[PDB]
């Protein structure tokens, strides 16, 4: 059919500042059973309707996957502002695809704290839609310059999550798949 197990059932997800991007093409995808039978925590479509995605088809489909905070799923949506929206993953105001998210406290959470996942905390300006910043270098706060090392007003841009099972649903990890939308017809 179409590689949706490779996206939704992948063993490891990428950090939000380094979200994956898989092109979906030359396949027949049955979104109807995915919506109706798969019990996700969130399935929101903005430019389309989930129950009639099959009759439409597109030149290409993109699937983006990343792990974010529990209450940080709010800003995965068009027109949203927040740490992820400005600095990690910006979504277009005219976004036409769907956003899928589910709780992953059973996989991405550790007792010692899962420092495996990072999120960009400081940046010079807001991101363009569908643009990501891989390079990490010390961020200059204030007006004094930076010698390339952390210091008083020089910060490491990437702040790590510390997922623990007792953090609460607000801070528990959430695995998010963002779908962007005639080679893929239902």
């Amino acid at each position: 059919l179409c590689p949706f197990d490779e996206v939704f059932n992948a063993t490891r997800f990428a950090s939000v500042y380094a979200w994956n991007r898989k092109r979906i093409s030359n396949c027949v995808a049955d979104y109807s059973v995915l919506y109706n039978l798969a019990p996700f925590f969130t399935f929101k479509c903005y430019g389309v309707s989930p129950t009639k995605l099959n009759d439409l088809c597109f030149t290409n489909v993109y699937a983006d996957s990343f792990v974010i905070r529990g209450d940080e799923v709010r800003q995965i949506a068009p027109g949203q502002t927040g740490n992820i929206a400005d600095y990690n993953y910006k979504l277009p105001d005219d976004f036409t695809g769907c956003v899928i998210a589910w709780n992953s406290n059973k996989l991405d959470s550790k007792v010692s704290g899962n420092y495996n996942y990072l999120y960009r905390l400081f940046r010079k300006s807001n991101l363009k839609p569908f643009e990501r910043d891989i390079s990490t270098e010390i961020y200059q706060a204030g007006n004094k310059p930076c010698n390339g090392v952390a210091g008083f007003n020089c910060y490491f841009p990437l702040r790590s999550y510390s997922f623990r099972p007792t953090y609460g649903v607000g801070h528990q990890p959430y695995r998010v798949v963002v779908l962007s939308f005639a080679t893929v017809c239902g």
Partner: antibody
Amino acid sequence: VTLKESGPVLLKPTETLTLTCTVSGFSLSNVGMGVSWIRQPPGKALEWLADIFSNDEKSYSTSLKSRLTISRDTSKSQVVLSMTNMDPVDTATYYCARLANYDFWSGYSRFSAQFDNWGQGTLVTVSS
Amino acid sequence: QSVLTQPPSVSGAPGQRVTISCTGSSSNIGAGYDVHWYQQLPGTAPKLLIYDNNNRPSGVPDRFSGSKSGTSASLAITGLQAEDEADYYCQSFDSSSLTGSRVFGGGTKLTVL
């Protein structure tokens, strides 16, 4: 869509209450909605109690999580709520509501779900 | 007590604007969660009135509107008719627990003078 609770019941203190909701117009197996229970003391504000969804994920009030217990039965379309160690202060009108997303044509999100449909409620009285 | 707080009662003359406020904590409303408004007429079950910030269900008159700003949200009624005399409840999702929670407001009693 129609939700109906069980009949009113009077209980002694320290007893265990059991309330059942029968739903119609939608299936509990649908992933887009769940069923939740809300209680309202006479002349007081509403209080959310419990929550259950399609895949048996369950949530409870933090202060009452120990006393509460909820379950569902898709074959006969009912959700059962049980409360242990009933106190006289717990007398209230118990409402049964559907946790579904209005604007359903846009999808669903369990964070933004709201009690879009409510039952008529039942009166639970706790006294000697 | 409830996590969300509302003024206990508000009053207004017919045909005049009335606003009811609702404030939250660092979680729930402060965490970006939506705010829903319900109407409870005397001797009746609550009815959904504002299903999302500034979003309105079908059948609810245009004179009802809502907004959210920071850790507070409000409900605004442009006119004031006879039937606008019920209790209005603020509601939002609270994420400060292991499985999440849903918090109601204290309820505001609206009266028409």
